[PDB]
């Protein structure tokens, strides 16, 4: 058992001062040191009077296999990005070898993230993910818009799913991802989702990431038409949007991006066991705009970084700074608090892990960070944490310091 | 004489490959190494084939005296920020002692800035500024909304101006700043601007930073009314906006912030020898919104950071990232190019120094930075410079490496 007394605790929902945290694997008590040592005389006390304790972040959406990308893929516009992925992935993917994967995951921890949602298209990231101390939801992604080759795509997905499933434990979950409504034909999607139903697996889907997707699904026109004509020899979207969305009705689903989702889709998703995953940097850099947080207010959201295929870092502090800036008309002190909650508790909820909150009974998944100096107004703490922090002093996963 | 051969030169307006730069104090030639050594057999050649050369940044607006602020001033809303400045400045200002000023200026250079516009309200930053290797326009700021005490405010301004003027040389210019149209009564402003006229000094003014200012000047109402009533015992704005703006007609002026400027003001300023100074982080953090770059397209703009009184860093790379994000609907590859030009050449133009461009005859004020790896499309270089760079490998001011 250990006790840490910081300047303040961000729970994340509240700011607690004049209390410490007793923990082992889980958070056991939150009280004054005076009271804690009565209960835990065996716990050494660390006084960190110029530090803050907050939960470890969740990052519920990242494409680890693309972690060698720096400037190879094309930014600025979604369809050119997708062409660039198709062009470069055969070389880019193997460039992220075991050492690259291992280092990338270690750096996630070092920047204060303690739980991730890994989107895996090819499965060669499995060993690195099971080796990591992180909590991981390992989403086995399926893709395939041609009904005639669904069998091959399904068989690969199924094999990857079962390869991951043997490694399940309290910190590692095997899951299912559907690439998108434009790239996964209905029947193949349903087959993959039936595996999720059978096992109670979490599900992720990219939904309405781009305006091109919006127009293609709605009208069978727009910039995606040339892409489907050239790349897939298809003249029309293979899916009816509403029918596709209904496939997710009985599952726990992460709807990623969601920038271009419409009011009807939002009402439907609000009725589901669903979370939106907001990836502000990726959306802005790919010419996809900015998710409107009023429009989606009926559905809980969490923050993620996406992969290094459409981001310059996997550091949640960088993501949170960008989030402040792409929602520039949200008053900063209150929005910073919202952001910290949505990067910790909300993402843990999306991933289904017992953490993201400094509360009794939660796993001791925590960050110890420096207190911004000269703080006048304690309610400004959330904002100053985002602005001034880039690396925690200590990061704990189930009480173990990394 | 020296020669550097990088992967590419950002001039900033163009990307040049397969050429090197010969320089001493000034850039002397841009040509292949083969051609340069014929002209400059005395110049050693540095091959930096995994680097880029670009101009040093200009940062035409910074309040150096507030460089001890981290979390003391109140963010989120302009008038509460101003109250916090009034409350805390007596203690905050002396906290930035000589060592703080010296370190702050050194860090500006280390982050790739080679020229600044320093706004000085009290003059205790003069020694540090003259000591720095930076190019500095040292703006002596005047403030005072009470016509009855204009003499005292004017005398202090005049003394500070002349104290700075004795230090003028090719890299250090004495200049004049008018705090704002709400805080400097017309007659005092005109007296200070007459000094600028006499000496041909550059001028800076904060103009339409906040909506409160807009409403106060336009209608004599809004959130500034309580402030003027309580703090100054004034019931009405002391200035007519148009009359105040006309004071700047015959001067070279930097109009800072400009978020809330109206169409009439923009047309007037476009007819003046004037630049807008865009401070995206400061404006967003103080609840002032975002400058609309279409609205002001008729007036050249440059990027600045403001002081650490309303920013978390003085690093232009951080400012440029934030600029990408607060203008999220500007296509990223082209906007990044615009930003790099507006942080180098445009800011040098605003400050009146011969730099900000890698061109023959300009001062050799340059940055050598790492080339982002794996670059497929060279036109993406500007974007990847912003995303992946935080500290140059070398920074030159008039050819001297720092
Ligand atoms: Fe993704
Ligand atoms: Fe300023």
Distance of CA A367 to the CA centre of its chain: 18
Q: Which of A69, A76, A290 sits opposite B332 (nearest CB)?
A: A76
Q: Which of B70, B332, B374 sits opposite A374 (nearest CB)?
A: B70
Q: Ligand 2 centroid vs B149 CA: distance in angstroms?
A: 23
Q: What sign for the dihedral angle of Cα B140, B321, B335, A69?
A: positive
* Experimental technique for the deposited model: X-ray
d(CA B23, CA A190): 66
Q: Tokens standing for B110?
A: 């280390």
**Tokens 């959406």 appear where?**
A61
Contacts of B75 in chain A (CB under 8 A): 332-333, 380, 383
* Chain A CB within 8 Å of residue B50 CB: no
What is the enclosing helix (H) or strand (E) of A124?
none
Q: Which of residues 72-91 of B touch A (CB under 8 A)?
A: 72-77, 84, 88
Q: Tokens standing for B208?
A: 């339409």
- Strand A2-10 vs strand A20-23: parallel, antiparallel, or unpaired? antiparallel
Long-range contacts of B373-377 (CB under 8 A, 24+ apart): B373/A70, B373/A71, B374/A68, B374/A69, B374/A70, B374/A71, B374/A72, B375/A70, B375/A71, B375/A72, B376/A71, B376/A72, B376/A73, B376/A74, B376/A84, B376/A88, B377/A74
Burial of A394 (0-12, 13-18, 19+ CB in 10 A): middle
Burial of A300 (0-12, 13-18, 19+ CB in 10 A): middle
Q: By the 8 A CB rule, do B390 and B324 touch?
A: no
Q: Which of B76, B321, B332 sits opposite A332 (nearest CB)?
A: B76
Count other Cβ atoms within 10 Å, centred on residue B314.
23
* B326 contacts A71? CB cut-off 8 A: no
CA distances in angstroms from B392 to A72, A262, B51, B367, listed in the order given: 22, 44, 10, 6
* B74 contacts A380? CB cut-off 8 A: yes
* Chain A CB within 8 Å of residue B41 CB: no
* B376 contacts A75? CB cut-off 8 A: no
Q: Which of A312, A321, A326 sits opposite B387 (nearest CB)?
A: A312
CA distances in angstroms from A169 to A137, A236, B136, listed in the order given: 11, 43, 61
* B334 contacts A376? CB cut-off 8 A: no
d(CA B86, CA A192): 62
Hey, of B69, B72, B76, which one would you mutate to test binding to chain A, going by the most A CBs within 10 A of its CB?
A: B76
d(CA B290, CA A329): 8
Contacts of B377 in chain A (CB under 8 A): 74
Q: Ligand 2 centroid vs B63 CA: distance in angstroms?
A: 6
Count other Cβ atoms within 10 Å, centred on residue A86.
11
Query: How many Å lie between the alpha carbon of B285 and the closest alpha carbon of chain A?
Result: 6
d(CA A81, CA A96): 19
* B384 contacts A332? CB cut-off 8 A: no
Output the CATH code of domain B57-356. 3.20.20.140
Whether B209 is catalytic? yes
Q: Ligand 1 centroid vs A262 CA: distance in angstroms?
A: 20
Residue A262's SS3 state is: coil
Query: How many Å lie between the alpha carbon of B218 and the closest alpha carbon of chain A?
Result: 23
What residue in B sits closest to A376 (Cα-Cα)? B72
* Chain A CB within 8 Å of residue B293 CB: no
Q: Ligand 2 centroid vs B210 CA: distance in angstroms?
A: 12
User: Which value in Å is the resolution of this experimental model?
Assistant: 1.1
Query: How many Å lie between the alpha carbon of A398 and the closest alpha carbon of chain B?
Result: 32
d(CA A267, CA A297): 10
Q: Ligand 1 centroid vs A279 CA: distance in angstroms?
A: 9
Report cis status (omega within 30 of 0) of the bond before A12.
Answer: yes
- Strand A203-207 vs strand A172-178: parallel, antiparallel, or unpaired? parallel
Q: By the 8 A CB rule, do A117 and A254 touch?
A: yes
Residue A87's SS3 state is: helix
Q: CATH top-level class for A1-56+357-402? A: mainly beta
Report cis status (omega within 30 of 0) of the bond before A196.
Answer: no
Ramachandran class of B386: left when φ > 0, alpha when ψ lies in -120 to 50, beta otherwise: alpha
* B71 contacts A375? CB cut-off 8 A: yes
Q: Which ligand is closest to the CA of A141, given by its number?
A: 1
Q: Which of A71, A372, A374 sits opposite B384 (nearest CB)?
A: A71
- Strand B20-23 vs strand B2-10: parallel, antiparallel, or unpaired? antiparallel
Q: By the 8 A CB rule, do A3 and A20 touch?
A: yes
Catalytic residue among A141, A209, A213, A319: A209
d(CA A20, CA A52): 11
Q: What sign for the dihedral angle of Cα A159, A160, A161, A162?
A: positive
Contacts of B281 in chain A (CB under 8 A): 325
Q: Tokens standing for B60?
A: 């035409």
Q: Tokens standing for A377?
A: 């107004």
For A329-379, list the strands marked E by DSSP. Answer: 366-370
Query: How many Å lie between the alpha carbon of A67 and the closest alpha carbon of chain B?
Result: 12
* Chain B CB within 8 Å of residue A361 CB: no
**Tokens 């400027």 appear where?**
B261
Sequence ranges of chain B with CATH classification 3.20.20.140: 57-356
Identify the DSSP state of B184.
B
A322-346 burial: b if 16+ Cβ within 10 Å, else e: bbbbbbbebebbebbbbbbbbbbbb
Q: What sign for the dihedral angle of Cα A277, B284, B282, B277?
A: positive
* Chain A CB within 8 Å of residue B388 CB: yes
Q: Ligand 1 centroid vs A175 CA: distance in angstroms?
A: 15
Q: By the 8 A CB rule, do A379 and A112 touch?
A: no
Q: Ligand 2 centroid vs A56 CA: distance in angstroms?
A: 36
* B376 contacts A71? CB cut-off 8 A: yes
Q: Which ligand is closest to the CA of A61, given by its number?
A: 1
* Chain A CB within 8 Å of residue B332 CB: yes
Catalytic residue among B141, B209, B319, B338: B209
Helix locations, B134-252, DSSP H? 150-165, 186-199, 211-219, 223-227, 241-246
d(CA B380, CA A74): 8
């Amino acid at each position: 058992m250990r006790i840490i007394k910081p300047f303040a605790i961000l729970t994340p929902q509240t700011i607690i001062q004049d209390k410490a945290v007793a923990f082992d694997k889980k958070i056991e008590a939150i009280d004054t040191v005076e009271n804690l040592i009565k209960k835990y005389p065996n716990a050494a006390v660390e006084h960190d009077e110029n530090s803050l304790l907050l939960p470890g972040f969740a990052n519920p959406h990242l494409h680890l296999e693309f972690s060698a990308n720096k400037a190879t893929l094309q930014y600025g516009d979604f369809i050119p990005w997708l062409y660039s992925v198709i062009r470069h992935r055969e070389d880019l993917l193997p460039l992220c070898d075991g050492a690259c994967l291992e280092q990338t995951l270690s750096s996630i921890i070092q920047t204060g993230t303690t739980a991730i949602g890994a989107i895996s298209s090819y499965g060669e990231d499995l060993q690195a993910c099971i080796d990591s101390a992180l909590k991981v939801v390992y989403f086995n992604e399926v893709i395939g818009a041609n009904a005639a080759t669904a069998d091959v795509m399904y068989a690969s997905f199924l094999e990857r799913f079962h390869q991951s499933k043997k490694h399940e434990n309290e910190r590692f979950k095997a899951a299912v991802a559907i690439h998108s409504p434009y790239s996964v034909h209905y029947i193949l999607a349903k087959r993959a989702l039936d595996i999720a139903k059978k096992y109670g697996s979490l599900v992720s889907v990219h939904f309405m990431e781009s305006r091109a997707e919006r127009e293609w699904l709605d009208k069978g026109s727009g910039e995606f038409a040339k892409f489907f004509k050239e790349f897939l020899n298809q003249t029309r979207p293979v899916n009816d949007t509403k029918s596709f969305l209904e496939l997710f009705k009985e599952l726990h689903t992460l709807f990623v991006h969601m920038v271009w989702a419409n009011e009807e889709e939002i009402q439907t998703i609000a009725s589901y066991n669903a979370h939106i995953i907001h990836c502000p940097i990726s959306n802005r850099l790919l010419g996809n705009g900015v998710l409107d947080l009023e429009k989606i207010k009926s559905i809980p959201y969490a923050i993620a970084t996406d992969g290094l295929s459409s981001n310059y870092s996997l550091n949640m502090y960088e993501e949170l700074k960008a989030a402040l800036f792409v929602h520039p008309n949200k008053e900063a002190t209150t929005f910073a608090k919202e952001l910290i909650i949505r990067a910790t508790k909300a993402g843990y909820d999306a991933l289904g892990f017992e953490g993201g909150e400094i509360a009794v009974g939660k796993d001791a998944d925590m960050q110890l960070i420096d207190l911004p100096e000269g703080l006048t107004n304690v309610e400004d703490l959330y904002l100053h944490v985002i602005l001034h922090t880039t690396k925690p002093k200590k990061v704990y996963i189930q009480g173990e310091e990394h």
